[PDB]
Nucleic acid binder design. Structure first.
Ligand SMILES: [Mg+2]
Ligand SMILES: [Mg+2]
Ligand SMILES: [Mg+2]
Ligand SMILES: [Mg+2]
Ligand SMILES: [Mg+2]
Ligand SMILES: [Mg+2]
Ligand SMILES: [Mg+2]
Ligand SMILES: [Mg+2]
Ligand SMILES: [Mg+2]
Ligand SMILES: [Mg+2]
Ligand SMILES: [Mg+2]
Ligand SMILES: [Mg+2]
Ligand SMILES: [Mg+2]
Ligand SMILES: [Mg+2]
Ligand SMILES: [Mg+2]
Ligand SMILES: [Mg+2]
Ligand SMILES: [Mg+2]
Ligand SMILES: [Mg+2]
Ligand SMILES: [Mg+2]
Ligand SMILES: [Mg+2]
Ligand SMILES: [Mg+2]
Ligand SMILES: [Mg+2]
Ligand SMILES: [Mg+2]
Ligand SMILES: [Mg+2]
Ligand SMILES: [Mg+2]
Ligand SMILES: [Mg+2]
Ligand SMILES: [Mg+2]
Ligand SMILES: [Mg+2]
Ligand SMILES: [Mg+2]
Ligand SMILES: [Mg+2]
Ligand SMILES: [Mg+2]
Ligand SMILES: [Mg+2]
Ligand SMILES: [Mg+2]
Ligand SMILES: [Mg+2]
Ligand SMILES: [Mg+2]
Ligand SMILES: [Mg+2]
Ligand SMILES: [Mg+2]
Ligand SMILES: [Mg+2]
Ligand SMILES: [Mg+2]
Ligand SMILES: [Mg+2]
Ligand SMILES: [Mg+2]
Ligand SMILES: [Mg+2]
Ligand SMILES: [Mg+2]
Lengths: 124, 262, 180
RNA sequence: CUCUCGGCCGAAGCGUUUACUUUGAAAAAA
RNA sequence: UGGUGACUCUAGAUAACCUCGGGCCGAUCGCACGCCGGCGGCGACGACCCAUUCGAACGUCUGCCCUAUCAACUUUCGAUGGUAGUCGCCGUGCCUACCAUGGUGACCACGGGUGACGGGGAAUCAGGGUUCGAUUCCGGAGAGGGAGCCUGAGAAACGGCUACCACAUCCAAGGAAGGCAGCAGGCGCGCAAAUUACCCACUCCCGACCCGGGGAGGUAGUGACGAAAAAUAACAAUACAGGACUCUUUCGAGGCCCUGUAAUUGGAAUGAGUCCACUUUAAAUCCUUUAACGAGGAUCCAUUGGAGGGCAAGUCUGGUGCCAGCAGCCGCGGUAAUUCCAGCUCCAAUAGCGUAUAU
RNA sequence: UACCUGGUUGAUCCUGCCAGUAGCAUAUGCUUGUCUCAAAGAUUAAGCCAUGCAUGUCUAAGUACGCACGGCCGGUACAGUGAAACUGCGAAUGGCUCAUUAAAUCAGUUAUGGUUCCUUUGGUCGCUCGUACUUGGAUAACUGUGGUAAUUCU
């Protein structure tokens, strides 16, 4: 019941189709507030929906009073999918990374380097 | 080292970029262009470190690939494009225009200009040569060559270029009494009236310049840029009007602002 | 090449003569009177005072109208007045040479916590600070060697999340109340 | 320091040349 | 015509030339589509030349350690200069032909050595100095040792090629393939130095490129190199060695203040740990934030060196008896050892402190 | 913090060194609870290396007749996604190390009026009086026959 959100800095990135701000969270007696509900607070504060709000970099100060992070509110979900880094979309479930490792791909590449044209597709 | 170098160490980057130490090993390494590497401001530095429109380099690339940034009226999608002195950066999507003008402390200040003033620029002339069936040619500090210039235009003069067409509209001759900015050295960013120029044949020429507050300083001739005819500049000056405060008066001004705050 | 910084300093210096009665006695007096952990804290304070005295001595030999002397002397005097070591009525450069080690030791958070009555001893003050019971303004300060600024002195409270300030009983009180 | 040029000054020499001293400029970042 | 301090510069005029191993003078792609029978808007590639940027390469001036048990050196095979050329991207003995006899040196030439890559810098330092700089920035060099090349704007490139020298792999004995002073890792050498980990999320680089790649780089692991902060207890009550303070006449009184045997009591406060959840992050870990548990020998138990002098702290006790040993130096030990071996006590620094070596 | 102390003599004052004292770097010993930074096969062997990785790259816009997918319509030359291959660019940067090197390297200062320069940027690109409503031959990918114990061979 006692969790306050304030936004210190604020700018409208018209070129990146969003609003970017610094968020400070007041939670005097609780753990660091989860991102999922900071998103709800931001959506209610800015009269948007939580699906276009991306928050990150939340660091809690010594003594346990406040947390500070950054937030973006996109004009639309398609703009967010165009402009957001892929890992932040994966946090919201909108993106999935490939399951291969660096070693797997590197060894496959160096194996393919030993064969001529179509046989390159026959090694994996 | 065989062949040209393609990297730039962060600690080896020019100091006026105001780059920190712990963000990375490397620096943006400006692309080859109209301005020298040491005297330019790469597009990424301006768009990310200065204006805070982007948080990372990838965001700067995303901004530039939508063709929103124009440098002197032309769309520039290269994020390491060297933008230098008197360049005009236009962002139509958000609708602002900047002119890269040195601040008093020798750094490119964020200086917003009106869209009327973003239609032209001033260029120092570097050389004049006749070629190709007796056609004269001018070369500016911006690496643009203009054929058929006014016969009165001599070296070390200043020409006003209409960015849309690229032609000369008027000019200021290099003479005592004309306003100038220092574009290099210890007095970089300082604005004053030219007092006297002493010639040393076979060597560098020294130009003496007096501020609006009465302070005088010398520079080399290659470090002088004619800004206006007489006391009146032909462009808008940054918030600091080109005068340098000593550290004492700067501290006094800061303290006065602190006292008046709140 | 890496993206790391390697600037670091030693905050103290060691005395040249390891065993001498007068120095040992004076250091022990300071340790007992200000509740210090060891002699390294005394030598740390001594080193800061020595650096300040060296800077002042460098400035004194300069000309009075020298702009560098005026600038850094003003900065040094304002820093010393700001932490409470110097008096505003004694804001001349030579008075810096009159400062003692006890002046810098009196501005620690430990001694100020003891002087304000939040603790009944200097050692109780140290354990109170290290146990997160003490706050300066709104920030809970955990470091005994926290030089209290002159403006920051009036805001030293009991850290309202602590049992002494915020009225929440600790481990021992809760366990002993459960035994009832 | 003066005799000449250009608008009382700006120019020109050369006072044997310096060393020295003071100033100014140019001088990577760390 | 224009320019420079200074052109044999720039431009102009004339007579020719213009390499078959040729110089430019568009036979290229995409998107919108149009107008008046033909004209066209945006771009992308390409291109001789000029300028510009990024350079690079030669030069100018001054500056380098030790050594004379190195005093004369270079010049017949260029040493110094002149003339003409060759080659080179160009200025040049760069090389050639012909000439001249020059050029350097006690102001240290030439030769030798260096545990010599050079700087920015580092340690110490009153002032002056001495020493270090392989090491993340700049410059140079090299890719086992020499040498020679192709391609290319740019290598005399070695994660390109061709040989020889030294090593060395597979072989069916005919042949083939090599280069970790890249990241990990192994051997060897040693007094002496970490994981055959995760990732392109950040900084930037490359490419035809908003998209791919990057052991550059970032993140963890090991890590007492070193630097910063900083626990190992605090308080109250007793009881007192007790002390000061205090009246009284000595006791006493003095119950104000302090210290400590306190294996005397007593509740309070905590984080080291264990551990949900957040937060962190590319994914994590750590730190920070917060539940729950978590301290009386609070055994949740601080060490390393010393105790004759230098130099701080025991001529206390037991053992040994010029032995064993200590001792940087002076010295201690031969039956009452302030010095050895121990117990107790004490003191110096303290999460650190001894020792060897360079300075 | 501009500092000294023990040791030659029966005793003294000197010279003078030895020893002590503090810092800094390497190694090593004993010890080690929290937390933030952080050096790290330089020294001896620029000694030798198993194994894996460290340099690749496509836009709307050079070349697509791989059904490998997918058509929409099915003669609409060429829908689109697109492996491969040709073409172009990069691979001369970065990283490592310190063997060589003693006016050499390097540093500051100057010069190129004595040269080269991919790229980016601007100029120039009907300036020349002499089949075009589009020219020619290949080669790769692909399809098929193979050789060698063996290679990123062909
Ligand atoms: Mg390199
Ligand atoms: Mg010149
Ligand atoms: Mg510097
Ligand atoms: Mg010649
Ligand atoms: Mg000759
Ligand atoms: Mg000859
Ligand atoms: Mg060597
Ligand atoms: Mg050296
Ligand atoms: Mg080195
Ligand atoms: Mg070495
Ligand atoms: Mg280097
Ligand atoms: Mg090489
Ligand atoms: Mg080797
Ligand atoms: Mg080679
Ligand atoms: Mg290799
Ligand atoms: Mg290489
Ligand atoms: Mg290795
Ligand atoms: Mg061994
Ligand atoms: Mg070690
Ligand atoms: Mg990346
Ligand atoms: Mg990528
Ligand atoms: Mg690395
Ligand atoms: Mg671990
Ligand atoms: Mg050690
Ligand atoms: Mg430490
Ligand atoms: Mg903790
Ligand atoms: Mg002991
Ligand atoms: Mg003993
Ligand atoms: Mg002793
Ligand atoms: Mg003593
Ligand atoms: Mg010893
Ligand atoms: Mg002894
Ligand atoms: Mg004698
Ligand atoms: Mg004697
Ligand atoms: Mg000594
Ligand atoms: Mg010692
Ligand atoms: Mg922990
Ligand atoms: Mg190394
Ligand atoms: Mg080695
Ligand atoms: Mg290819
Ligand atoms: Mg290119
Ligand atoms: Mg290439
Ligand atoms: Mg061009």
């Amino acid at each position: 019941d006692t969790v306050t959100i304030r936004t210190r800095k604020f700018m409208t990135n018209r070129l990146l189709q969003r609003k970017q701000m610094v968020i400070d969270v007041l939670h005097p007696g609780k753990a660091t507030v989860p991102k999922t509900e900071i998103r709800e607070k931001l959506a209610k504060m800015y009269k948007t929906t939580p699906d276009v709000i991306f928050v990150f970099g939340f660091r809690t100060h010594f003594g346990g009073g406040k947390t500070t992070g950054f937030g973006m509110i996109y004009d639309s979900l398609d703009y967010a999918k165009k402009n957001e880094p892929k890992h932040r979309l994966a946090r919201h479930g909108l993106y999935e990374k490939k399951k291969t490792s660096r070693k797997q791909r590197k060894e496959r590449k160096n194996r393919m380097k030993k064969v001529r044209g179509t046989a390159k597709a026959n090694v994996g | 080292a065989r062949g040209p170098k393609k990297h730039l160490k962060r600690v080896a980057a020019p100091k006026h970029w105001m780059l920190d130490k712990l963000t990375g090993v490397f620096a943006p390494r400006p692309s080859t262009g109209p301005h020298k590497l040491r005297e330019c401001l790469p597009l990424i530095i301006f768009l990310r470190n200065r204006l805070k429109y982007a948080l990372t380099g990838d965001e700067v690339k995303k901004i530039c690939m939508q063709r929103f940034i124009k440098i002197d009226g032309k769309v520039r999608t290269d994020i390491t494009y060297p933008a230098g002195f008197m360049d005009v950066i236009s962002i139509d999507k958000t609708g602002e225009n900047f002119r890269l003008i040195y601040d008093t402390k020798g750094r490119f200040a964020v200086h917003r200009i009106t869209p009327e003033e973003a239609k032209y620029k001033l260029c120092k002339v570097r050389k004049i040569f006749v070629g190709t069936k007796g056609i004269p040619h001018l070369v500016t500090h911006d690496a643009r060559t203009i054929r058929y210039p006014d016969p009165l235009i001599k070296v070390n003069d200043t020409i006003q270029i209409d960015l849309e067409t690229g032609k000369i509209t008027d000019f200021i001759k290099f003479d005592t009494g004309n306003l100038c900015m220092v574009t290099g050295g210890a007095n970089l960013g300082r604005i004053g009236v030219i007092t006297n120029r002493e010639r040393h044949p076979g060597s560098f020429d020294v130009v003496h310049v007096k501020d609006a507050n009465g302070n005088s300083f010398a520079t080399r001739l290659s470090n002088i840029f004619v800004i206006g005819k007489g006391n009146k500049p032909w462009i808008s000056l940054p918030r600091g009007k080109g005068i340098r405060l000593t550290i004492a008066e700067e501290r006094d001004k800061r303290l006065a602002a602190k006292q008046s705050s709140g | 090449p890496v993206a790391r910084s390697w600037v670091c300093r030693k905050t103290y210096v060691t005395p040249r003569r390891p065993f001498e009665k007068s120095r040992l006695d004076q250091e022990l007096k300071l340790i007992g009177e200000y509740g210090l952990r060891n002699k390294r804290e005394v030598w740390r304070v001594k080193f800061t005072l020595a650096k300040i005295r060296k800077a002042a001595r460098e400035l004194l030999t300069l000309d009075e109208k020298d702009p560098r002397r005026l600038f850094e002397g003003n900065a040094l005097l304002r820093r010393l007045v700001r932490i409470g070591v110097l008096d505003e009525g004694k804001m001349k450069l030579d008075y810096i040479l009159g400062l003692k080690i006890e002046d810098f030791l009196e501005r620690r958070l430990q001694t100020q916590v003891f002087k304000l009555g939040l603790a009944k001893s200097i050692h109780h003050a140290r354990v109170l600070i290290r146990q997160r019971h003490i706050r300066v303004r709104k920030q809970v300060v955990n470091i005994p060697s926290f030089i209290v600024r002159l403006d920051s002195q009036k805001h030293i409270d009991f850290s309202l999340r602590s049992p002494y300030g915020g009225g929440r009983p600790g481990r021992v009180k809760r366990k002993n109340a459960k035994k009832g």
